[PDB]
């Protein structure tokens, strides 16, 4: 007996939530690109070792771990498909700030995020085709957004390059600009948490299911651990290890929601309509825990 | 394709998009053009 709120899409609270999300993204990207250099980005582009290992880790671990979790946990056909689309999605921009929290060579982080988004728009239908075989004999190849991906990539790169230019041109705006941006980010985050709690209501109890919670808990943690292990095994720098892992662990869950909404009616995808939200909150919690653990470990090294 | 949504990296709902004029939140969201949805009779069957 799963029932969505009577007016979910059309409500002042939902429009407000979307507006604050957009503002959060813009200000986060501006204050996050305010700590990069063009020369380091060019150097990372000209040395594609880190980008290659990051892409290999993402597109060979996340879809594979989603498929293995779906097979092991004996999920339904729709449930096993929902996790698979999340696994095939590109790494989100949360990885950039998450790596910022661990001093992780931000130029490599932004390079990996951009190239991962491009390779996603290139090869996500291929991964879906070769991994979905067995569930949903349907196509699902024309449901992944294509122009939207590149438009979003450009629209998130614009504030990043604006911040980079601001840092390179005149640095005395940093203290005034950075603090304000941070303040905006904190206010927007508390507002977005409150608004999400208000909008979701008591309907979140329906989608928690022990299996859904379990898979959405292991998947980001498994991604983090596997990415770190692979980066360490490839004899990479300690700074690059953290960013590679915490990029391969994060995912862009908006694509999974949009594709599922386009392909299937809401009633078919009822209980797992909130799966992207569960993945987002679980990955946020695990990232915060990892950041706290790393900071405590660094405090031990003084 | 049939999907013309501008994804938001920090988004978890279909209406979380980067479109300036938030038509998704209005009463006529036109970001999806697939009325030929699949009911998937064996969606809830394991294997």
């Amino acid at each position, epitope marked *: 007996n799963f029932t969505l709120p009577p007016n979910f899409g059309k409500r002042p609270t939902d429009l407000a939530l979307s507006v604050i999300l957009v503002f959060m993204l813009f200000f986060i990207m501006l204050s996050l690109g305010c700590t990069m250099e063009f020369s380091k980005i060019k150097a990372h582009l000209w040395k594609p070792k880190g980008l290659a290992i990051a892409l290999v880790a993402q597109y060979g671990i996340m879809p594979l771990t989603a498929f293995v979790l779906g097979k092991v946990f004996r999920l339904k056909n729709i449930e096993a498909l929902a996790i698979l689309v999340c696994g095939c999605s590109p790494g989100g921009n949360l990885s950039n700030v998450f790596s910022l929290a661990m001093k992780g060579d931000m130029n490599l982080s932004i390079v990996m995020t951009t190239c991962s988004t491009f390779c996603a728009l290139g090869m996500m239908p291929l991964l879906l085709y070769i991994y979905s075989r067995g569930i949903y004999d349907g196509d699902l190849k024309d449901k992944v957004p294509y122009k939207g991906i590149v438009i979003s990539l450009v629209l998130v790169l614009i504030p990043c390059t604006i911040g980079i230019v601001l840092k390179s041109k005149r640095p005395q705006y940093m203290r005034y600009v950075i603090k304000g941006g941070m303040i905006i980010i904190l206010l927007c985050s508390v507002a977005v948490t409150v608004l999400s709690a208000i909008n979701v209501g008591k309907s979140i109890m329906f989608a928690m299911t022990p299996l859904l919670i379990a898979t959405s808990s292991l998947m980001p943690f498994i991604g983090f651990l596997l990415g770190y292990v692979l980066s360490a095994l490839f004899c990479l720098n300690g700074r690059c290890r953290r960013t590679v892992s915490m990029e391969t662990g994060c995912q862009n869950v908006q694509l999974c929601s949009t594709i599922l909404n386009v392909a299937f009616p809401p009633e078919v995808i009822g209980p797992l309509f909130f799966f992207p939200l569960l993945y987002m909150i679980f990955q946020l919690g695990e990232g915060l825990l990892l950041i706290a653990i790393f900071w405590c470990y660094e405090k031990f090294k003084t | 394709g049939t999907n013309l949504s501008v994804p938001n990296p920090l988004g978890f709902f279909p209406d979380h998009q980067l479109d300036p004029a938030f038509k998704a939140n209005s009463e006529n969201p036109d970001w999806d053009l697939n*009325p*030929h*949805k699949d009911n998937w*009779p*064996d969606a*809830n069957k394991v294997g």
Partner: antibody
Amino acid sequence: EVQLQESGPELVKPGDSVKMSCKASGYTFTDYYMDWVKQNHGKSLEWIGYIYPYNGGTNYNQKFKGKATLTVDKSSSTAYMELHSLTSEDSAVYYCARRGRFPWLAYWGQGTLVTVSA
Amino acid sequence: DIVMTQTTSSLSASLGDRVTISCRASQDISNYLNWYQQKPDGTVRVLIYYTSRLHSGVPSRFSGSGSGTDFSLTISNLEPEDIATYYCQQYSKFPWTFGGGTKLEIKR
């Protein structure tokens, strides 16, 4: 072969609610949508709404939102429809249809005739 | 709300002649129209879905294709069993409206 059986003819005074039953058979029931279609005396069809048997999700037409409630009773595999406050304007045959895969009405019932008079 | 209109309310067909039932849409729907046949004793049956595909069971003589706002349903040779009321339904928008008015009869 899938076959749908309806409750039968009904006769209700104005303002007294009625219920329509649609006994599904020939398939496992809880994987296909059930849509209800109302035909006027002249012979013009209007789509009322649908119900998902697996979770009871419903969505009605704007006109019929006030006076249409859909239940499934998955144990007996017989969908129901209630009309609450019926006036003399609504009458004639109501059909239950089973939507198949893509959005088209595949198999229809024989139809239930409803007459409202005092 | 899309208003579905059918050009003719009653059509004469005789026997062994093909009748093209024309359905016109208020706005563009782009190949999201279905066809239904209602015999005189109720028993509504679906003939064509997605405007080009025959439902499993209907005779192969039923056909008809169209795109945009103009649609057709061809019957080819007409048997006495194919004397009924034919409806065109769209599902481009949620209300799912119907045509509602095409009837067939024998010429004499």
